[PDB]
RNA sequence: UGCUUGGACUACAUAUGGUUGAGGGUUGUA
RNA sequence: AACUCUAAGCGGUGGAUCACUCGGCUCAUGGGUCGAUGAAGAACGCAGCAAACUGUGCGUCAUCGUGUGAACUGCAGGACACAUGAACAUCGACAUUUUGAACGCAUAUCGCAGUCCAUGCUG
RNA sequence: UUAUAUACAACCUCAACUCAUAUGGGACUACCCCCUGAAUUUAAGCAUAUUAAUUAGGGGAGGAAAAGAAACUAACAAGGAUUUUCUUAGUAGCGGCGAGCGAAAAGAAAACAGUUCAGCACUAAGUCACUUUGUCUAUAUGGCAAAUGUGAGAUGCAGUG
RNA sequence: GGUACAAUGGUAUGCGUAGAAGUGUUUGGCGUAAGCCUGCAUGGAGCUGCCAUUGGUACAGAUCUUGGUGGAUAGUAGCAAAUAAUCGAAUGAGAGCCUUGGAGGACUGAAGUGGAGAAGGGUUUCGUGUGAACAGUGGUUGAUCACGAGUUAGUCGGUCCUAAGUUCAAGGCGAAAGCGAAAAUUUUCAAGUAAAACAUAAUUUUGAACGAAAGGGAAUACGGUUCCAAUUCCGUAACCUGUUGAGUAUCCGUUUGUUAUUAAAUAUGGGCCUCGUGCUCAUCCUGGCAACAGGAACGACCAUAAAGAAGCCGUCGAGAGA
RNA sequence: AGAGCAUGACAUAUACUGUUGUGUCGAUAUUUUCUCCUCGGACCUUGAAAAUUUAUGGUGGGGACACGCAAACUUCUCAA
């Protein structure tokens, strides 16, 4: 065969991804039968070859659907907690810098009348 | 005991599968040092305390 | 006889072998082996004779 | 309706609102 | 050619001595990052042949994308899947079982629920 | 209204929810803050003392933490937040004045950074949070405006100070 | 003052796979001595003299520490409790074992050494294979070692209920941890509705949960079957729980078969009326004097009663098993 | 189901099985087993609880009507 590529799995449809999922599932079911009934080739080692072939149809189906939810939970505040930036717990709480460095009107008025002047000293 | 729980039967199962020898190809790998199994228990000489 | 997933509750195994092998079941019994794997003795009905079903599975 | 199977949810303490309310607690137009 | 004494030689028993060192220790430098978005920890599973360690979570000794550009090896088997990419790193994607602060109630129990959405069997 | 006999209202004190949104527990151990607090030991015995305002126990954080811009020194010709090192100094003091213990100002360095409230004759609540609607351009606990929609707010929000 | 060990800084135009360190030795020596140099033998990749400066720097002792070893001793240490084996055969490299089967003498003597369970154990079970080690003798066998397998439930248990008790719930308290509290804390803290009216309306607070494989607690037995499982598989005959469905406590006097008499028919009475078919009345079951009976014959809530529900020693009678 | 079972008479070679007979009377004593029922005793000792279950009673409320069509979460019988 051809190694099933995530690069070429991505151009498929929603139907063809889960219709390729069951027929690789059915192979692994038949190779699971043939492992203990004395599989007559020295190995039908397509166990690992189709075991990882379904992991990638899964990966591609799963990130074709989370990237679609991220398209719907654009423009809405209160997106799900999974489509929301797990950085660290400390970083998510600690005054989002859009008001960690906002300032009082008394300090914006001390700011605009005496700037640090730029000077040099010797004779 | 012949009336056990599900959780003692799975910890008894895992110590049962772990009571194999070392496969003998493993001593054919390159620069190998594993000779015997060092975590073999007998049922009659070392108890499990479960 | 099958080896099944350790968390399959006998309405799984009855429904699994219908979907996979196009049969019907009289009775399922269920064991958990002393190595820790769940068996399932799936007695078929009287119509689905298990020798026609065994060689179509792949076993003898 | 009917049994199974899968999923979402159902802890506590708190803040701010919302919503339903209690009280011969002070009062008011009648 | 009793046994004994002593010496050396040879053989044994033993594992010192010396020479090694992907390990320790000590000093210094740069950096600042866990967790109710489920941490640390635990448990059990997962490999063609594997018990441990290491890795992982039914997508289970791996994993998208990248980098590099021919291996992996104990033995098979395939690599026609460089030449549209092996094996490795790297890792930003998806994912992460039962647990655990552990959050329906319990738990020497895989015990007992509720509410709700679906499907799979009446009509 | 309230012979607790028709409503009606508004507050105030308190409830309830699988309400909307959020927040908190637990881990680590070297350093850090808050607490609690011994005895061995030494005194050639031993009780105060010492060990020690320490081991152990408890709690809380950060990449540092704590401290910090004077209710401080000095007695000068005066200095000027904090913290660290050197010196002061094993000094002044404290002590069965025994064993022992024991700082600070000044001086010399490293580094340097300053400020904000409450409370007045501010002299039109001049403020804020939501929510919705336009509409910016992170996959934004964002940006602006509209309705000033609903609330916080006169038991005091902003600006000045 | 001198000598051993290891290093660092210098130094020796040092030494070394043409054999370094180490070790061995009747090679020859030197030194009062610590020690040193040397030959040969083994060994296989590093090391030494000098000046300085050093340091985890020199062992016979510590009932020293770790390891190894000797005698004692191949043994007058010992392998003597639980009565006892013997014949012949086969297998085998080898047999007193456990290896087997046959015969035979014995023991346990059923309060057992028999047959099953609960704790606990965890694969030890079983088949085949087997070589060392282990079975304090042997071993052809094994609870050893290798490989393969094996544990089936609506009825047996768990699970459900509570006991003694326990864990938590904010009255509380404590610096906190947490009470080696037992909180009983706690505005409506709990229920209730083929669900209402001038409060919809009647009612209750000890919250909650765990804690019994011997207490309480629905339902199954036989015959057969395996190398290995059976109240579980197989056959046969039942049973319980839940949910639907069907049948079946009300098949009249009038008047169809029938002139009334009746027949279909738990089955009418009344008064009049042409009799009546006119009119009107009527079925949430019957029997027995009773004790109580039958196939059924108002679980929708309150109330009360009973069952669950019980100890120990005895006991006439009955049945079962033996 | 001369069931099944067991004892027993033949027949059929592993040639993949059939068969004929039996299984019947009486009566002991089991203070020594287990159950069931009865009736007692000792006690300044009086010998669990809850789920669960049933019967009754009560006020309302439900149904039922003869010229016949019915019924019945029906405490009845069966079925899926």
Among B13, B17, B21, residue whose Cα is nearest residue B37 = B21
Question: CA-CA distance, A67 to A74, in Å (whole number)?
Answer: 11
Beta bridge partners of C38: C4, C32
CA of B34 to C1' of G56 (A): 36
Beta bridge partners of C4: C38
C chain contacts of residue B16, beta-carbon cutoff 8 Å: 34-36
Nearest chain B CA: its distance from C8 CA (Å): 15
Question: CA-CA distance, B38 to A65, in Å (whole number)?
Answer: 48
A40: left (phi over 0), alpha (psi -120 to 50) or beta: alpha
CB of C58 less than 8 A from some CB of B: no
Is B9 near strand E, with its CB below 7 A from some atom of it? no
CB of A34 less than 8 A from some CB of C: yes
Cα four-point dihedral sign C48, C54, C55, C58: positive
Among C34, C33, C59, residue whose Cα is nearest residue A36 = C59
Question: CA-CA distance, B9 to C11, in Å (whole number)?
Answer: 23
Residue A8 backbone phi and psi in degrees, to 5: -95, -15
Count of Cβ atoms closer than 10 Å to residue B4 Cβ: 12
Q: By CA distance, what is C19's nearest residue in A?
A: A26
Q: Give me the resolution in angstroms, 1 decimal.
A: 3.0
Strand order, beta sheet including C2-4: C2-4, C38-44, C25-32
Most B-contacting residue of C35, C37, C38, C39 (CB-CB within 10 A), to test interface: C35
Nearest chain C CA: its distance from B10 CA (Å): 6
User: In the complex, which subunits touch B with 3 or more CB pairs below 8 angstroms?
Assistant: C
Question: CA-CA distance, C43 to C10, in Å (whole number)?
Answer: 12
A41: left (phi over 0), alpha (psi -120 to 50) or beta: beta
Count of Cβ atoms closer than 10 Å to residue C40 Cβ: 21
Question: CA-CA distance, B11 to A23, in Å (whole number)?
Answer: 36
B&C contacts, CB < 8 Å: 16
CA-to-CA dists, residue A82 to A61, A68, A70, angstroms: 17, 13, 10
């Amino acid at each position: 065969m051809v190694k099933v590529k995530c690069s070429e799995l991505r151009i498929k449809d929603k139907k063809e991804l889960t219709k390729q999922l069951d027929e690789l599932k059915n192979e692994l079911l038949s190779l699971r039968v043939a492992k203990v009934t004395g599989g007559a080739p020295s190995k039908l080692s397509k166990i690992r070859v189709v075991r990882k072939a379904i992991a990638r149809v899964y990966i591609v189906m799963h990130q074709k659907q989370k990237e679609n939810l991220r398209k719907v939970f654009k423009n809405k505040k209160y997106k799900p907690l999974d489509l929301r930036k797990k950085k660290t717990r400390a970083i998510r709480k600690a005054l989002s810098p859009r008001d960690a460095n906002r300032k009082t009107l008394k300090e914006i008025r001390k700011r605009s009348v005496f700037p640090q002047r730029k000077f040099a000293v010797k004779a | 005991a012949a009336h056990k729980s599900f959780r003692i039967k799975q910890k008894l199962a895992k110590k049962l599968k772990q009571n194999r020898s070392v496969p003998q190809w493993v001593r054919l790998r390159t620069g190998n040092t594993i000779r015997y199994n060092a975590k073999r228990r007998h049922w009659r000489r070392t108890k499990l305390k479960l | 006889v099958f080896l099944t997933h350790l968390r399959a509750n006998k309405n799984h195994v009855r429904a699994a072998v219908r979907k996979l092998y196009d049969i019907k079941v009289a009775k399922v019994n269920v064991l958990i082996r002393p190595d820790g794997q769940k068996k399932a003795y799936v007695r078929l009905a009287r119509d689905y004779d298990a020798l026609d079903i065994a060689n179509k599975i792949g076993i003898i």
